[PDB]
Amino acid sequence: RDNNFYSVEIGDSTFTVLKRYQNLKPIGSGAQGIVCAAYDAILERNVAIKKLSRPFQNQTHAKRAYRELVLMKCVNHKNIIGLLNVFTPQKSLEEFQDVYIVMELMDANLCQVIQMELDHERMSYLLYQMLCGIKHLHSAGIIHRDLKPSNIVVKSDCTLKILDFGLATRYYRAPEVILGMGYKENVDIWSVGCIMGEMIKGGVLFPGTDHIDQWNKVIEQLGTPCPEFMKKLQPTVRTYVENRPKYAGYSFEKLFPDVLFPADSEHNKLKASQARDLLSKMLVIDASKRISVDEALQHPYINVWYDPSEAEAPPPKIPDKQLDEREHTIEEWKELIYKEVMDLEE
Amino acid sequence: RPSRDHLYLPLE
Ligand SMILES: Nc1ncnc2c1ncn2[C@@H]1O[C@H](COP(=O)(O)OP(=O)(O)NP(=O)(O)O)[C@@H](O)[C@H]1O
Predict the structure, then answer these.
(1) Could you tell me if A154 and A268 lie in one domain?
(2) Helix axes A120-138, A187-201, angle to 10 degrees
(3) What happens after mutating residue 166 to S (chain A)?
(4) Is A146 a catalytic residue?
(5) Statement to judge: residues A88 and A121 lie in one domain
(6) CATH no. for residue A256?
(7) A102 contacts A83 by C-beta, under 8 angstroms
(8) Which domain holds residue A156?
(9) Chain B CB contacts of A155 below 8 Å
């Protein structure tokens, strides 16, 4: 079996990959290691390759990796990153060490897009695409909770995909999350509010070092939440919110002043007000007053790009159910993951 | 529906 693989060094690590993947180059990095570009000689297109080193070394790693495999396999939507291939170089359960995930290749993450010149056309489209992908996830009960610019990728044609499937420091986490409260689908709409806002102002809306500093920077801006929210926190946490200085915050006029948008064409102040509006529907601390995914898609700023084939797609059929709520021994995870890698390879 | 063909991000 070993005749099918070759190895190349990528910085520190060794990528042992099927011979169909040629010319690996590093395209980015993160927790789960380095990610490469490659040329797939079979499909005759460029692809992306992610190496998972011992996805089964401990419960957290295994649970996360297994879920991602299964979900990436069964989900098929243009705004969610698609699985092209998955393989392992080791030739038996015992030797089994590593998992390689082969994806569609994109050009950059959202961090770069923010440090970059934009307009309403492209901004509205990027936001429209994010919403589509989210809606799709929600339609299968996947609620992300952890959307950030680094896990969202774009292509030069301005197309966008979400790199991962969220939870089963954090600037973009919704207030209802930093405060250990209940959440619904629109918890992800907070994240999208932060990202939008961040594109506009060029910099992070709420840069806290921990959970404490994070929350304060939110009330400082939008103001202390209503009495109807501060007593929605469990006794312990409802103690903090009614224990720190109370601010009035700013209007979304002061947070996102006219000067931040192009105000030439009559229709460019139109878009400017439309954009400001959506932000205020999204960055609502109280997750009950907050706009929903279906609502945003309808909002005038966004809906110009509406297409039912992409905004209203059939939900994924996730065939594992117990998925993201099962517990196994490390040895059982190794089996599950290996099994799933073997079954999913083309 | 407006065209998405010309939309470009200088990333290449
Ligand atoms: N399919 C891809 N196409 C283009 N770039 C990618 C792709 N996958 C990953 N990247 C890049 O590699 C970086 C690493 O992200 P990723 O490997 O998905 O993990 P992450 O966002 O760092 N953290 P985590 O998901 O916990 O491992 C991304 O920010 C992208 O810049």
Answers:
(1) yes
(2) 160
(3) In a renal clear cell carcinoma sample; somatic mutation
(4) yes
(5) no
(6) 1.10.510.10
(7) yes
(8) 108-313
(9) 9, 11
Structure tokens at A14: 């060794």
> Do A301 and A166 sit in the same domain of this protein?
yes
Query: Up-side HSE of residue A300: CA atoms within 13 Å toward CB?
Result: 9
Taking a contact as any Cβ pair under 8 Å apart, which residues of chain A between 295 and 324 contact chain B?
Answer: 304-307
* A178 known ligand binder: no
Resolution rounded to one decimal, in angstroms: 2.6
Tokens linked to A281: 């529907």
Which residue, judged by its Cα, is nearest atom 11 of ligand 1?
A28
